[PDB]
Structure 1
Amino acid sequence: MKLKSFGVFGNPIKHSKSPLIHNACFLTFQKELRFLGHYHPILLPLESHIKSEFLHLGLSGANVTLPFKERAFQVCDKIKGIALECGAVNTLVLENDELVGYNTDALGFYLSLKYQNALILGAGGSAKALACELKKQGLQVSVLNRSSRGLDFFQRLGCDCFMEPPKSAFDLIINATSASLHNELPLNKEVLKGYFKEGKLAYDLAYGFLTPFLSLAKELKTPFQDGKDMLIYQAALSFEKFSASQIPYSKAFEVMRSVF
C-alpha cells in the first residue's frame, strides 16, 4: 500500500487522543483512500519550528495543538478557509508543495454545541478561533485575560475585551485558557460561581478529566460540557482535509466517536 504520515504537534503532547481517533479512521478508510495513513504524536520543543519538522518527517498532514496554533498561522505558506479570520491554525496539509493551514476548531466548536452572548477566558489560538466563530454566529463576545495579549485581534473582531471580570450575565462561559492543562480554576472561585449561577453553559476545552472549572459548574447544577465533542468534530474535519476532501467529516466523526 501507498503510505502517508501524519501527526499532531504540541507541547505537551502525551495526553492527545488525536492519534487514537485518526488511526482508527485511516485503518478503515484505506479502502476508499487507496493509501494507508499513520498518525503519531510529536513533542516539539517550544522554540524549534514547525515547518522544518513537518518537512523533515515527510508528513502529508498534521494537527497543531497548544501552544503552537498562532505560530502555525504565521509559518504556514498559505491560509485557507475560516482560518483566515482565526489568527490560528490547527490543521496543516501539504498541497502541491505548499504547507497549507486550516482551522477546524471554529466549526468543531460550533458542531459540539447543541445562546445570545459568551465570555471567553483565554487569549491563545483556541480562544481566537472560538471568538471568530461566536461573533460569526451573531453572539456578543467578551474576552477576559490577565494582560493585553491579543487585544488587537479580538477588538478587530468586535469583541469586548477585559482584564477585570465584567459584571454581566453570560449564556456561555468558556475556559479556553492558553498554554495550560486546566488543572486549576482560571478565575477566582467566587467570581466563577457568580457567572455560573447567572449562566446557561460552562464549557471547558480540556478533555479526558473533569476540570475544577467544570466541577464547580456541576456542583452548582449549571449545565457543563468538556472538550470531547469539540475534539472529535475538529478531528473529523481535519481528517476530511487529510483525505483531500474525499471522506466527509460526518463519516470520520462516526468512527472517531466510537473509538474514543
Structure 2
Amino acid sequence: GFRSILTGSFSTPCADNPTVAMVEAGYHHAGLDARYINCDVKASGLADAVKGAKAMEWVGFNCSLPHKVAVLDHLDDIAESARLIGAVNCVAIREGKLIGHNTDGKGFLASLKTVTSPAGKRVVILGAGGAARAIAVELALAGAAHITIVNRDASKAETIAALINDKTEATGEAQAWSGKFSLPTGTDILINATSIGLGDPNAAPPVEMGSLTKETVVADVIPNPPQTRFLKDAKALGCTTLDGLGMLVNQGVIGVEIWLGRTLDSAVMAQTLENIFG
C-alpha cells in the first residue's frame, strides 16, 4: 500500500546534489515503490542520522561531504575497497546491520569494463584527490599492473602510490606535474581526476595530447559537461573516451544493486542528469 522502500543521503550542503533526481528516475522507470531522501545532516548529527535510518527501516543510504570518513565510526562492517580507501559513500542496512561500501571508483571501473579489462593495464591518473584515491584502489584490486598518479603536489600523489604498493599487487608510482604531462610509453588508460574542465568547456588539464596513442582509453570524472574539452580532444585524435556522467550513472546503479538487488535503467538516469545539467 503506502509503505515505500526508503533510501537516501546524508551530506551538507545537499541542495545542489542531483542524485535524488537521478535515482528516483530509475526507481520510477522500474516501477519500484522506492524513494530517495536527500537530507542535510550536519557533522554533529551524523551519528543520530545513521541510527535514525536504521530505526526508520531504510535499506540504504549514501554519505557525501563531509561524512565519508566520519561514518566509518558508525558502521558494523566495512568492505575491502572501503577499508583500503578509508572512506565510505554507500551504506547498506541488512537486518539492522550497517555495511559500508565505497563506490567512488566503481562507476569508473564499470564504464572502463564496457571497453576493456583493467587487468594487467598501465594507467595514468591526473590528480590526487578523493576520486583519484578510490579509482587507484579499484583499478589495483581489479588487477591493473601499474598506476602512475600525477599531481602538482607530488607528495599527495606519493600517498596514493604508497597505498597501492603497500596494500595491493599493483605497482604505484608518483610524478610531479610540471607543464604538459607526457604519458610514459605503453600507457593503456588515461584518467582525469581533476576538476579542470568542470563547468568550463574551454578548460583542460595540461597534458601533451600528442603523447596519446589512438589505442589509449581516455576517461574523465567530470560529469558536467560530460563531453569535456579533454575528452573532445582525445576523441578527435581517435581515442575511445569515457565520460563522467556515465560514471555517476554507474555509481547509482551499483549503489541500488547493493541496496535492493535491482539494476536500474542507465539510459533514463543519464538523460535525467543531462536535463539537469542543460
Shorter-normalised TM-score: what interval? Answer: 0.7 to 0.9
State whether structure 2 residue 192 is matched by structure 1 residue 162.
no
User: Does structure 2 conserve the Cα–Cα contact (< 8 Å) formed by 1:13 and 1:42?
Assistant: yes
Q: Normalising by structure 2, what TM-score? A: 0.70
1:40 is aligned to 37
Render the CA deviation track for 1:181-222: whole Å, top value 9, x for unaligned: 8347574x3x34344467712211121313343344345454
Rounded Cα–Cα distance in structure 1 between residues aligned with 2:222 and 2:41:
20
User: Does structure 1 conserve the Cα–Cα contact (< 8 Å) formed by 2:147 and 2:173?
Assistant: yes
Change (3 A) 1:80 1:26: same
State whether structure 2 residue 138 is matched by structure 1 residue 133.
yes
Render the CA deviation track for 1:114-150: whole Å, top value 9, x for unaligned: 1631111233332222212222233321112224233
Rounded Cα–Cα distance in structure 1 between residues aligned with 2:234 and 2:14:
27
Deviation at 1:12, TM superposition (A): 5.9
State whether structure 2 residue 110 is matched by structure 1 residue 92.
no
In structure 1, the gaps of 5 or more residues are none
User: Does structure 2 conserve the Cα–Cα contact (< 8 Å) formed by 1:199 and 1:222?
Assistant: yes
User: Does structure 1 conserve the Cα–Cα contact (< 8 Å) formed by 2:214 and 2:237?
Assistant: no
Q: Normalising by structure 1, what TM-score? A: 0.74
Write the letter of the residue equivalent to 1:104.
Answer: T
State whether structure 2 residue 220 is matched by structure 1 residue 224.
no
1:153 is aligned to 163
Rounded Cα–Cα distance in structure 2 between residues aligned with 1:240 and 1:186:
34
2:276 is aligned to none
Rounded Cα–Cα distance in structure 2 between residues aligned with 1:26 and 1:192:
42
Aligned identity (percent) is: 25
1:207 is aligned to 223
2:49 is aligned to 53
Write the letter of the residue equivalent to 1:234.
Answer: Q
**SS in structure 1 at match of 2:155:** coil
2:23 is aligned to 22
Rounded Cα–Cα distance in structure 1 between residues aligned with 2:13 and 2:176:
27
Change (3 A) 1:221 1:112: same
**SS in structure 2 at match of 1:177:** coil
Change (3 A) 1:193 1:253: closer
RMSD: 3.5
Change (3 A) 1:48 1:159: farther
Deviation at 1:172, TM superposition (A): 1.5
1:143 is aligned to 149
Write the letter of the residue equivalent to 2:255.
Answer: S
Change (3 A) 1:222 1:29: closer
Change (3 A) 1:130 1:3: same
Rounded Cα–Cα distance in structure 2 between residues aligned with 1:17 and 1:137:
32
2:107 is aligned to 108
In structure 2, the gaps of 5 or more residues are 274-278
Deviation at 1:176, TM superposition (A): 1.7
Rounded Cα–Cα distance in structure 2 between residues aligned with 1:103 and 1:171:
25
Change (3 A) 1:51 1:37: farther
Change (3 A) 1:121 1:61: same
